Amino acid sequence: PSRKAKVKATLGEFDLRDYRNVEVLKRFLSETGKILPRRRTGLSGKEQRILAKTIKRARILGLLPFTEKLVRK
Amino acid sequence: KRQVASGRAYIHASYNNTIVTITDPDGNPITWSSGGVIGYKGSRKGTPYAAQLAALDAAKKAMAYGMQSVDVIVRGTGAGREQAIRALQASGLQVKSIVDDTPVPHNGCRPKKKFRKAS
Amino acid sequence: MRRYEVNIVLNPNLDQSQLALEKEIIQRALENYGARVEKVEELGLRRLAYPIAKDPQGYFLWYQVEMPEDRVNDLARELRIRDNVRRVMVVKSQEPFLANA
Amino acid sequence: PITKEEKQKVIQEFARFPGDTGSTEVQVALLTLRINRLSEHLKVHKKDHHSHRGLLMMVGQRRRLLRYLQREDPERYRALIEKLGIRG
RNA sequence: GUGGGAGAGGGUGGUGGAAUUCCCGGAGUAGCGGUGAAAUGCGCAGAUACCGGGAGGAACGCCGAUGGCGAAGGCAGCCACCUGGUCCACCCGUGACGCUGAGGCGCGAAAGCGUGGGGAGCAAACCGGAUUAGAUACCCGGGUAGUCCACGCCCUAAACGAUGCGCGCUAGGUCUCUGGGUCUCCUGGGGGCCGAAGCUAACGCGUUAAGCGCGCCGCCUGGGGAGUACGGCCGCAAGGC
Ligand SMILES: [Mg+2]
Ligand SMILES: [Mg+2]
Ligand SMILES: [Mg+2]
Ligand SMILES: [Mg+2]
Ligand SMILES: [Mg+2]
Ligand SMILES: [Mg+2]
Ligand SMILES: [Mg+2]
Ligand SMILES: [Mg+2]
Ligand SMILES: [Mg+2]
Ligand SMILES: [Mg+2]
Ligand SMILES: [Mg+2]
Ligand SMILES: [Mg+2]
Ligand SMILES: [Mg+2]
Ligand SMILES: [Mg+2]
Ligand SMILES: [Mg+2]
């Protein structure tokens, strides 16, 4: 699946290296802590890469989860 | 005897059997059922049917304490899971919701041969 | 010296006093290591994606003290000695790799 | 690490003439620096095998230049040494 | 040299959360477990399932690739420090300072060894259940060495691209990682696939050659006996060359 819209379009000029930008980062995670793929985020290796290094900080810090519970079903 | 009215229902499905549990809000169980409980004992404990019977028993007995609204939580991927869930729903118990909380390590202990093989 | 961003998350249950106390060390101990606080931006209370120290929230800080590399795994080794301090994050500063601009 | 200064400082110390970056001395000297450093790092991190091979090459590259110096102009050679800290 | 870039390349210290096991408390009751079926096993000294707390060991989900780094073995939570290699642009410096490399020296997965420590999960041996004509096995329940750390050994492998290193030459297409540009595309470095000429027993290789050439090293000479015997060298030993 995933032919909707990339998580990059729905957003603007933003430091992909800012580990505090919760409001934006939260956009790169599934219904779980899971870090969205590229087919999803629609980023470049260099980018997608950095994103993660950043996300993984949001985590230790406490701003971002490691995993979420799946509602619905 | 206690009169809970609103609690949660934990469903633990496994390839081998399904045990269902109904606790109260804070988390403490009230009553529980299982393939064994309902009577099946052996290879049958796993079959969805059993799960249906089990889940419904978890309810009946739950109904006693005055339960009415559970927040079904699933764990495991065993056979007869999305099955037990369908029971609690059609049990009268207003199923507030459903959630999948099957635990999963971020690479913890080496599984046993039975489930080994990395990729 | 190098530019390091410092993040600090301490117990979100202090009164003006109890708190201004911690920051006395966060500043004292800090200067004792060649602090040089290029800046600061106290964000305060935060709703943590997950409880930390069994606390549903946290009080966040953030600096930019430029200091002597040799004395960093130390500076932090020092900030950790605190009790009401539950997180010490010391990242090295980095240009803003802007994305989608 | 070795600072831009640290480096330049050593270059403008051996260079045959203002503008000499790649002369056979500058190089040796320069190396000797990079070497004498890592030789320290490894004095500690004995387990750091990979870095070592890095040094096992600088030393080579170093003696190889010298071997060439001692050939062309045995004078400058006898010089670079006394100036640095080799042959002893 | 200068200015830039990428990276699970290495070493040391710290530190994050998920999971299993164990302990403590709550609540709760007759089973859980496991299999093709079962049994052994565990549970009313209260197990399983659920909630809270604690201790500890090991490994790091998603990102993750059909990706990257490394000479090879190999390398992925996050942070800092210490450190190696390498690529691009500038054309700035030296002026053949080059290639290869017997022997030497160093590194070298796993298993294994020595001393000390650690020991959650896993598990040779082993102890049991089951299956079977038998079962010294595949399946199940346990479990020691080990797996982990340090220090010292050991030196093997389908240690594989089964393809030694270096340099030049010889159509293209396409996908991709990383740098530069006047950024449709051109240009450099690396990873793939299809392919000219050509090569090849065939399969296949084909600017990442197995093509056309030069240099240096290693190696082969029918199968079995045999990677054995003898000798030597190495190792604490197993055992290695
Ligand atoms: Mg020139
Ligand atoms: Mg000249
Ligand atoms: Mg020679
Ligand atoms: Mg070894
Ligand atoms: Mg080993
Ligand atoms: Mg041992
Ligand atoms: Mg076991
Ligand atoms: Mg076994
Ligand atoms: Mg190419
Ligand atoms: Mg290319
Ligand atoms: Mg042809
Ligand atoms: Mg081909
Ligand atoms: Mg023969
Ligand atoms: Mg042999
Ligand atoms: Mg001997």
CB contact under 8 A, C97 and A13: no
Contact present, A and D (at least 3 Cβ pairs less than 8 Å): no
* Per-residue buried b or exposed e for C64-98, using 16+ beta carbons within 10 Å of the residue's own CB: ebebeeeebeebbebbeebebbbbbbbeeeeeeee
Which helix (H) or strand (E) element contains residue D76? helix D74-83
What was the resolution (in A) of this experimentally determined structure? Answer: 3.2
* Domain coverage including residue C21: 1-101
- For residues C55 and C9, what is the distance between their CA atoms, to the nearest angstrom? 11
- For residues C11 and C4, what is the distance between their CA atoms, to the nearest angstrom? 23
Strand partners, B14: B17
The count of domains in chain C is 1
Measured CA to CA in angstroms, residue A51 lies from A44, D3, D56 at distances of 10, 31, 38
Distance D49 CA to ligand 4 centre (A): 14
CB contact under 8 A, B97 and A70: no
- For residues D77 and D88, what is the distance between their CA atoms, to the nearest angstrom? 15
Question: Regarding the domain delimited by B1-119, which CATH topology (the fold level of the hierarchy) does it fall under?
Answer: Nucleotidyltransferase; domain 5 (3.30.420)
- β-pairing verdict for B69-75 and B8-14: parallel
**CATH at C74:** 3.30.70.60
Phi, psi of C44 (to 5 degrees): 75, -135
CB contact under 8 A, A60 and C48: no
Which helix (H) or strand (E) element contains residue B20? strand B17-23
What number does CATH give the domain D1-88?
Answer: 1.10.287.10
Helix or strand or coil: residue B67? coil
* In chain B, domain spans: 1-119
Beta-carbon contacts of D37 under 8 Å, excluding residues fewer than 6 positions away, are: D2
Method: X-ray
Asked if residue A27 lies in contact with residue C52, where contact means CB atoms within 8 angstroms, the answer is: no
Asked if residue C12 lies in contact with residue C45, where contact means CB atoms within 8 angstroms, the answer is: yes
Asked if residue A14 lies in contact with residue C99, where contact means CB atoms within 8 angstroms, the answer is: yes
- For residues A23 and A71, what is the distance between their CA atoms, to the nearest angstrom? 21
Measured CA to CA in angstroms, residue B34 lies from B59, B60, B71, B114, D21 at distances of 11, 13, 18, 25, 82
* Chain E bases having any atom below 7 Å from a protein CB: 1-3, 6-20, 26-39, 48-54, 57-65, 67, 70-73, 77-85, 92-98, 106-108, 120-123, 139-141, 151-152, 176-179
Distance C55 CA to ligand 13 centre (A): 79
CB-side neighbour CA atoms (13 Å) of B83: 20
Asked if residue B103 lies in contact with residue B75, where contact means CB atoms within 8 angstroms, the answer is: yes
- For residues D49 and C50, what is the distance between their CA atoms, to the nearest angstrom? 41
- For residues A48 and A42, what is the distance between their CA atoms, to the nearest angstrom? 8
Which domains does chain A show, CATH number per domain?
Answer: 1-73 (4.10.640.10)
| Token output for B30 | 């009230």
- Listing DSSP states for A28-42 in one string gives GB-SSS-B--HHHH-
